[PDB]
Design a protein around this ligand. Structure first.
Ligand SMILES: C[n+]1cn([C@@H]2O[C@H](COP(=O)(O)OP(=O)(O)OP(=O)(O)OC[C@H]3O[C@@H](n4cnc5c(N)ncnc54)[C@H](O)[C@@H]3O)[C@@H](O)[C@H]2O)c2nc(N)[nH]c(=O)c21
Ligand SMILES: Nc1ncnc2c1ncn2[C@@H]1O[C@H](C[C@@H](N)CC[C@H](N)C(=O)O)[C@@H](O)[C@H]1O
Length: 259
């Protein structure tokens, strides 16, 4: 019924080469070559980011959709790309990152980029079972893709329900992943969250066309349905006229040392 639902159905029907071409079409992308080379040599001292995810929070921060201040909580921190980006910012007092870490490449990776000494990581943490704690800036980047839209809907609602649980009175700043924002249930829930907490929703250009993920943020006020639909239209437009080419820019580089 929604344009996002049409997008998801069409996406799932794409042939293999069509899918690969489509997913990068007109997206923005950071060049990860430098960071990967250094990490391969165990060079944790260097001013690099541990993940591609850092590019998303940099865009959100630099473009004024999110202020990053005080006590930062990073729910689903993974390797720590957002946590280390936050730690380098002058208004940040501390960072606590929690993540499941049920694989491997997806546990926190220690680094010595700026403010590393004010970051504390806890692996094997389920943020859904944990008690909440206060924060000034609440970040959450959880939402695991599924070809099944109903699974994506369920996962999104769970994340939003838990976000509301964690969203404290002193939480002025927030950024939550909305995996599948186009589902009517998700739109309806976000609208009620917005009445309580204000804020708005945004598409980060570093997201692949193969996901409809958007971010609910504190830094801008906008119309949820309008913003989601505009993204659905962009995604469908790219599907009918795919360039097959991403726009590559410089990675998230950071200063180094203690704070
Ligand atoms: C691997 N793949 C994923 N998708 C779709 O793209 C979404 C994102 O899949 P991803 O591979 O880009 O990201 P993920 O996190 O799943 O890894 C999936 O939920 C699925 O609907 C595909 N569609 C076609 N048509 N052909 C594919 O090969 C394909
Ligand atoms: N219930 C949960 N509790 C804690 N972490 C989770 C949960 N579900 C998923 N995760 C983790 O959340 C992470 C999401 C990642 N996309 C985060 C990337 C991160 N923002 C970065 O820049 O590196 C994954 O590593 C998941 O393992």
């Amino acid at each position: 019924v929604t344009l996002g639902e049409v997008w998801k159905r069409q996406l799932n029907m794409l042939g293999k080469q069509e899918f690969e071409r489509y997913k990068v079409s007109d997206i923005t992308e950071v060049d990860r070559t430098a960071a990967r080379r250094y990490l391969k040599e165990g060079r944790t001292d260097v001013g690099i980011s541990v993940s591609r995810g850092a590019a998303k929070i940099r865009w959100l921060h630099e473009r004024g959709y999110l202020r990053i201040t005080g006590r930062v909580l990073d729910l689903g921190c993974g390797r720590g790309g957002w946590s280390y980006y936050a730690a380098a910012q002058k208004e940040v007092m501390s960072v606590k990152g929690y993540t499941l870490g049920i694989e491997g490449h997806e546990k926190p990776i220690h680094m010595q980029t700026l403010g590393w000494n004010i970051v504390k990581f806890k692996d094997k943490s389920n943020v859904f079972t944990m008690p909440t704690e206060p924060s000034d800036t609440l970040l959450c980047d959880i939402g695991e893709s599924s070809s099944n839209p109903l699974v994506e809907r369920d996962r999104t609602m769970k994340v939003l329900e838990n976000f509301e649980r964690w969203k404290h009175v002193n939480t002025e700043n927030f950024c939550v992943k909305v995996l599948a924002p186009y589902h009517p249930d998700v739109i309806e829930k976000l609208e009620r969250l917005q009445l309580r907490f204000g804020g708005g929703i945004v598409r980060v250009p570093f997201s692949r066309n193969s996901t409809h993920e958007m971010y609910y943020i504190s830094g801008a006020r906008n119309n949820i349905t309008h913003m989601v639909n505009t993204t659905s239209r962009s995604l469908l437009r790219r599907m009918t006229r795919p360039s097959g080419k991403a726009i590559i820019e410089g990675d998230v580089f950071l200063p180094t040392g203690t704070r």
